Design a binder for this molecule. Structure first.
Ligand SMILES: O=C(O)Cc1ccccc1C(=O)Nc1ccc(-c2cc[nH]n2)cc1
Ligand SMILES: O=C(O)Cc1ccccc1C(=O)Nc1ccc(-c2cc[nH]n2)cc1
Ligand SMILES: *Cc1c(COP(=O)(O)O)cnc(C)c1O
Ligand SMILES: *Cc1c(COP(=O)(O)O)cnc(C)c1O
Ligand SMILES: [Cl-]
Ligand SMILES: [Cl-]
Lengths: 357, 359
């Protein structure tokens, strides 16, 4: 009921590509594993190459597709580490089950990914702010037009080296368009899984945001306009709450929120410091507006594998620009999180969150 | 701006497959249409042998569901003339889908001609036995070799064809049972359930398995705190009843964002409006209204509409634990039969009609 890393077939490349925008440059090899009625085949690391798909593949008709996204970091000691990969494996499997795609063993796949990165180790940059982006994918591959549980599937992993997210070597804030007409996900839906179907529909909304002079979309939900997510990031607010208490709040995992790995790590870190209240609670636009008027908001930011932490300085809501005082406040919490994550990720501090390749 | 049928290139196949017990969606004809789009605009359209697609592993079609599709039928009449049912509507709907996903625009009439040309090449695949048809499956997908979530700079439009048998075994319309569970949501206001995008279907697979597990054949998709009946499986839903105000009516949910605007659905409203024999409306329908109408003997027929079956009677709805009998079959089903008959006449050339497009 799962492929084994022990059965790995390696096929090194004939012509290695020469080393050098996110998501454009890929490495020499990829992981591929086929599944069918006779279960999982043997995993193989093969050179990077195209997929060959039947024109009726359910991956293309009915979006039987899911992905992951995580980063591997090369520290000063030249050792490569993945950040909390076990959580990505957990989330990938939940995604798989939701789309009736075949179950697999999380440790086997991780080992296969480790083996794949081992093989392309030379691709992992080591300049400040850089990393290798790891993109696993599982797709249905039924050669029929019936909307049904696939009897064929493909799991593959590709790797993309990436440069520093903040070019200045310093966090820079973003502006958000907050328009309630666009809804990313619904209770009872699939917004809490990393399914390809959740992203395609946001492309037009992101264009609307730029058209309107904003950089990303603030996803609102419900008649009370709950702040759910920022672009493809989780949202956090650092403020003095109504009851006079300083807290860090992020929306709870009630179904419309993608359970981000960084998000969970920011909650864990802040809980560990024990210096202020850390809570998972709904956040409405009205709470935010009242807190801003009353000078209670210190920092608003997104969390995700792309930037780690992204400051927010403006929200366009109801044709009205709300200034958010994040950068004015340091941004102290943001910088503290970035420094601890950086120290853990590049091996400056030992930590069980890191998985060595 | 758009590819042109004028520039069609044809590569006839040299490995024609042996023609056939037709199971929907598993048997394909010898040729396919294929047109690519990039920064230079659309390439030349081509008809070519049926073959696998080659895709970059980062293709946005597979990572961010930049994919949409259509579904329509070609019918071979008694006069052996092959005809498409209201294809212009499918073309309109496909274009709306493409725009919603920031996929490249095209000329609806040029694609239609290219499709006509393709069916003409595979004309001998069109079955002619009663209730059979040729299923047309146009697809448009983004194909950017990049993990960025953005408007693709490359896309692929293709069309494949499938011969299909009669939906109903001996021609007799056969009713279905539905699982109505509020825990399941197909689509939401502000979402994309009203476009024919691949993303709307993948999540239904697990729910359909649950319908089977619970002894039902299809899913009755409910929406909102008031349990509005929206769609039945991949079909629009219609209720024929005497409403609370004493008026005999045909009702279907309105196009308010959670309803896919079916070609058959529109055609049924057009026909029934034309007859002028009873009220025809687009209004939400709730489970509470249905239960009360069933208790009062006001329901005559409930049915789905779609390209698959045309019109599909419903005899049972399992709502939570209650098994509700729907008396569709005890009432003829008169309206269903009348729609079926009139559509068959139009579709198989028995009666020349502006709704038919000759191949
Ligand atoms: O947005 C997220 O946090 C998650 C996500 C969800 C969905 C799709 C993609 C991503 C993602 O990781 N995109 C990504 C963009 C840019 C870079 C980058 C550029 C220079 N350094 N790093 C790294 C990752
Ligand atoms: O359900 C719909 O009406 C639309 C749809 C939406 C989404 C996916 C597929 C369909 C569809 O057309 N499926 C389909 C099944 C079976 C047959 C058949 C079998 C014997 N004769 N014809 C024809 C079409
Ligand atoms: C990928 C993603 C995130 C962030 O998840 P991480 O695991 O922290 O990278 C947040 N929201 C959405 C919608 C996403 O797709
Ligand atoms: C395709 C489809 C229909 C029916 O549309 P027709 O154009 O009548 O075939 C109904 N509902 C959903 C959800 C669909 O995908
Ligand atoms: Cl962990
Ligand atoms: Cl028409």
């Amino acid at each position: 009921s799962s492929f084994k890393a022990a059965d790995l077939q390696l096929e090194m490349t004939q012509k290695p590509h020469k080393k050098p925008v996110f998501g454009k440059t890929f490495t020499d090899h990829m992981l591929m594993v086929e599944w069918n009625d006779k279960g999982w085949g043997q995993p193989r690391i093969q050179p990077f190459q195209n997929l060959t798909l039947h024109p009726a593949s359910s991956s293309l008709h009915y979006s039987l597709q899911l992905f992951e996204g995580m980063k591997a970091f090369k520290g000063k000691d030249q050792q490569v580490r993945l950040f909390r990969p076990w959580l990505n494996m957990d989330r990938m499997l939940r995604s798989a089950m939701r789309l009736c795609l075949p179950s697999f063993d999380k440790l086997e796949l991780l080992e296969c990914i480790r083996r794949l990165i081992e093989v392309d180790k030379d691709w992992v940059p080591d300049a400040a702010g850089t990393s290798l982006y790891v993109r696993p994918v599982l797709i249905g591959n039924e050669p029929s037009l019936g909307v049904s549980q696939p009897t064929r599937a493909l799991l593959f992993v590709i790797l993309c080296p990436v440069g520093a997210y903040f070019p200045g070597g310093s966090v820079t804030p973003v502006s958000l368009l907050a328009d309630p007409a666009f809804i990313r996900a619904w209770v009872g839906g699939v917004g809490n899984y990393k399914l390809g179907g959740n992203y395609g529909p946001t492309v037009l909304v992101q264009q609307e945001a730029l058209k309107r002079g904003c950089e990303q979309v603030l996803w609102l939900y419900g008649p009370d306009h709950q702040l759910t997510e920022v672009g493809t990031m989780n949202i956090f607010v650092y403020w003095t709450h109504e009851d006079g208490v300083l807290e860090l709040v992020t929306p709870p995992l009630n179904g419309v929120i993608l359970p981000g790995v960084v998000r969970q790590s920011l909650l864990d870190m802040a809980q560990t410091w024990g210096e202020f209240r850390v809570v998972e609670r709904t956040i409405t636009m009205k709470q935010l507006l009242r807190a801003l008027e009353e000078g209670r908001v210190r920092e608003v930011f997104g969390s995700g594998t792309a930037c780690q932490v992204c400051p927010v300085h403006r929200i366009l809501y109801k044709d009205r620009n709300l200034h958010i005082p994040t950068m004015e406040n340091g941004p102290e919490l943001i910088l503290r999180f970035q420094k601890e994550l950086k120290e853990i990720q590049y091996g400056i501090r030992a930590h069980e969150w890191m998985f060595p390749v």
